[PDB]
């Protein structure tokens, strides 16, 4: 509404780069950029002609044409999400690995802003593959694409996006009750979240998987998974594999799923 837009003020991207790059820090280059398509679309555009990107970041205030996974879109308005995108160099990893990536990310999202919820409500954690929820509602969602040698990872987390702008099962921190969020800081500690969880994965850090499963609202529950092609399988999550697949209890069978849309049931 027009009145989130005085709760919206503008990134500070001199303060940023003071911030996150420097001497300890991985982060090569930061960017804020007031408006593009789509700012994975963007990395993988400067990789593809011969840029190197690992480590680098892309912030956009605003999103015309967002992705999300398997095709879909991702909607936003201006400076109502953090929305960003880092370049990470994969080639060094072997490629059944790279699947861990993407719930590395979810992972620092969720660390980011979890402790800025006064209580959390009942479902704050990680959907399979790597939702970020709160309270039932989507406040965060990734997408990783794959550009030799780098793999592109993107997040757009809702700070102050109104669910009617975007989608009925959306959430953000100012509709959990985070009365003023400052983009500024949440920005900088998933920056430096994200880091910290990009070098646990390319070490094969066992503590990665274990944050994971911790935070995990998926295993354990009741779900319908929705797989590519439209085909609908009902069972019990169980585990993540070694691949960062999702194991399913179907009756006693085990079903291993790559890749595929998470319900969770009653
Ligand atoms: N802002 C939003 N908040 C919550 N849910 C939203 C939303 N905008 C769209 N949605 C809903 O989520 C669906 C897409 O979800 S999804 O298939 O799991 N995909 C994702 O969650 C990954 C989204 C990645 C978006 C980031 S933002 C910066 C980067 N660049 C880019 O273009 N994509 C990534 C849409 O079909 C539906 F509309």
Not at 135 to 142: D, P, V
Not at 226 to 238: M, S
Request: charged share 25%.
């Amino acid at each position: 509404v027009t009145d989130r837009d005085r709760l919206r003020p503008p990134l500070d991207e001199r303060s940023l780069r003071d911030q996150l790059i420097g001497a300890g820090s991985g982060w090569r280059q930061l960017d804020v950029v007031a408006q593009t398509g789509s700012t994975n679309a963007d990395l993988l555009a400067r990789a593809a002609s011969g840029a190197d990107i690992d480590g680098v970041v892309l912030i956009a205030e605003h999103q015309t044409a967002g992705r999300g996974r398997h095709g879909r879109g991702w909607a936003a308005t201006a400076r109502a999400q953090i929305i960003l995108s880092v370049g990470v160099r994969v080639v060094d990893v072997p490629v059944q690995a790279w699947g861990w990536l993407s719930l590395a990310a979810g992972l620092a999202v969720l660390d980011s802003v979890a402790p800025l919820i006064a209580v959390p409500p009942a479902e704050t954690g990680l959907k399979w593959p790597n939702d970020v929820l709160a309270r039932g509602g989507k406040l965060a969602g990734i997408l990783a694409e794959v550009a030799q040698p780098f793999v592109v990872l993107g997040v757009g987390l809702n700070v102050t996006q109104a669910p009617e702008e975007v989608d009925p099962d959306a959430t953000s921190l100012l509709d959990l009750g985070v009365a003023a969020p400052d983009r500024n800081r949440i920005a900088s500690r998933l920056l430096r979240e994200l880091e910290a969880r990009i070098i646990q994965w390319r070490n094969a850090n066992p503590q990665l998987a274990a944050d994971y499963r911790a935070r995990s609202l998926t295993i354990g529950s009741r779900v319908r998974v929705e797989l590519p092609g439209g085909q609908d399988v009902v069972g019990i999550a169980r585990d993540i594999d070694d691949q960062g697949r999702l194991c399913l209890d179907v009756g006693g069978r085990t079903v291993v799923v790559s890749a595929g849309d998470v319900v969770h049931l009653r």
